[PDB]
Design an enzyme around this catalytic site. Structure first.
Site, short mmCIF file in Angstrom:
data_model
loop_
_atom_site.label_atom_id
_atom_site.label_comp_id
_atom_site.label_asym_id
_atom_site.label_seq_id
_atom_site.Cartn_x
_atom_site.Cartn_y
_atom_site.Cartn_z
N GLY A 196 -0.20 -9.77 -0.51
CA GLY A 196 1.03 -9.03 0.39
C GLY A 196 1.02 -7.65 0.04
O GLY A 196 1.97 -6.90 0.17
N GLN A 197 -0.27 -6.98 -0.12
CA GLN A 197 -0.45 -5.67 -0.19
C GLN A 197 0.09 -4.75 1.15
O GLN A 197 -0.48 -5.20 2.18
CB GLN A 197 -1.75 -5.02 -0.09
CG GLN A 197 -2.27 -3.55 -0.51
CD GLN A 197 -3.71 -2.99 -0.96
OE1 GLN A 197 -4.31 -4.01 -0.90
NE2 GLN A 197 -3.75 -1.85 -0.87
N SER A 198 0.89 -4.07 1.04
CA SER A 198 1.70 -3.37 2.32
C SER A 198 1.06 -2.20 2.59
O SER A 198 1.26 -1.50 3.94
CB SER A 198 3.12 -3.45 2.07
OG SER A 198 3.21 -2.08 1.09
N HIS A 251 -1.13 1.18 -5.30
CA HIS A 251 0.12 1.49 -6.00
C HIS A 251 0.53 0.43 -6.95
O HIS A 251 0.38 -0.86 -6.75
CB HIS A 251 1.31 1.50 -4.76
CG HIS A 251 1.10 0.54 -3.72
ND1 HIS A 251 0.37 0.22 -3.00
CD2 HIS A 251 2.30 -0.27 -3.73
CE1 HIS A 251 0.60 -0.67 -2.15
NE2 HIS A 251 1.72 -0.95 -2.46
N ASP A 279 10.81 3.33 -4.14
CA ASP A 279 10.57 2.37 -2.84
C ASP A 279 11.51 2.71 -1.69
O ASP A 279 12.74 2.33 -2.26
CB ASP A 279 10.38 1.00 -3.33
CG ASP A 279 9.42 0.12 -2.22
OD1 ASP A 279 8.38 -0.26 -2.82
OD2 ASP A 279 9.98 -0.11 -1.44
N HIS A 304 3.89 -1.13 -8.53
CA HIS A 304 5.36 -1.40 -8.27
C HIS A 304 5.92 -1.49 -9.88
O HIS A 304 5.30 -2.27 -10.60
CB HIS A 304 5.57 -2.74 -7.71
CG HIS A 304 5.16 -2.74 -6.21
ND1 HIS A 304 6.04 -2.39 -4.94
CD2 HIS A 304 3.90 -2.84 -5.71
CE1 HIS A 304 5.39 -2.74 -4.07
NE2 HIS A 304 4.19 -2.96 -4.38
#
Ligand SMILES: O=c1ccn([C@@H]2O[C@H](COP(=O)(O)O)[C@@H](O)[C@H]2O)c(=O)[nH]1
Lengths: 115, 112
Positions: free
Chosen positions: B91-93, B98, B29, B100
Site C-alpha cells: 500500500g505504498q502511496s 517514508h 501526515d 509512518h
C-alpha cells in the site's frame, strides 16, 4: 545467558525452536508463529533492546540493518508485489514481547489504516 | 522521478514540520489515521525500501531514532506503531521511502 530471557532472547540462543530465514552476527529473521498475512516474519537484533522508545543513538546502524535484512528476506521469499514493515511500540502499539523486532508482512493486499 | 515529498523537502509546498536535520524531515501526515500520525523521510531520494543500499543502513536507522524522539516530544507515552510500506501489496502511496508513526489511540491487529 546473553540476550535475556524473553522468548526472543531464548530463540536467539537456540533454546526454543524457530523457523529461521536468515541469521548474521547482528540479527535473526524467523517466521511469526501467528501469521497475519500469507508471509509474516520477524527481524530481531541479537542485542537485547526492550523497545524502540529506549533505543540509543548508537543503535541506528543496527535498526537500519533490521530493515535491510527485512527487505532482502522479503525478496528471497518472493514477495515481488511488496510488503509492509511494522514496529509495535508499547501498549498503544500492542507490543507483547519486549525485545525489539520488525514485522514484515506480505503475500496479500495490505489495507489502510495499518490497524 | 520527483514526488510530492520532494516538493515538501524543498519547501515548495507547505507541511506541518515537526523536525528537520541535514538528512531527514519529519512532518504531520496530511491524511492522518490516528490522533497523531506523522512521517519521517530521508532527504536522499530512495524510492522504496526494496532498493535501499547497504550503505543506507544508518540513515534508515536514523529515521527510526528521529521517529521515536518525535513521538516522545509529541507526548506518545503510551506507545505507537511505526510502518514502512513497500509496493502495491504494501500500500505504498508515494515512491519516496517514508516511515509512518501513528499513535494517540489503540493500534489494532492485524496491521492492515
Ligand atoms: O514465540 C513467539 C512469541 C511471539 N511471536 C510473535 O511475536 C509478536 C509479538 O507481538 P508484538 O510485540 O510484535 O505486538 C506476535 O506477532 C507473535 O505472534 C512469535 O512469533 N513467537
Amino acid at each position: 545467558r546473553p540476550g535475556g530471557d524473553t522468548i526472543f532472547g531464548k530463540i536467539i540462543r537456540k533454546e526454543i525452536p524457530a523457523k529461521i530465514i536468515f541469521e548474521d552476527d547482528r540479527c535473526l529473521a524467523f517466521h511469526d508463529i501467528s501469521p497475519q498475512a500469507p508471509t509474516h516474519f520477524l527481524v530481531i537484533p541479537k542485542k537485547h533492546i526492550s523497545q524502540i522508545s529506549v533505543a540509543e543513538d548508537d543503535d541506528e546502524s543496527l535498526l537500519g540493518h533490521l530493515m535491510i535484512v527485512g527487505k532482502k528476506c522479503a525478496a528471497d521469499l518472493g514477495l515481488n508485489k511488496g510488503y509492509r514493515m511494522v514496529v509495535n511500540e508499547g501498549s498503544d502499539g500492542g507490543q507483547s514481547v519486549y525485545h525489539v523486532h520488525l514485522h514484515v508482512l506480505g503475500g496479500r493486499q495490505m489495507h489502510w489504516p495499518p490497524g
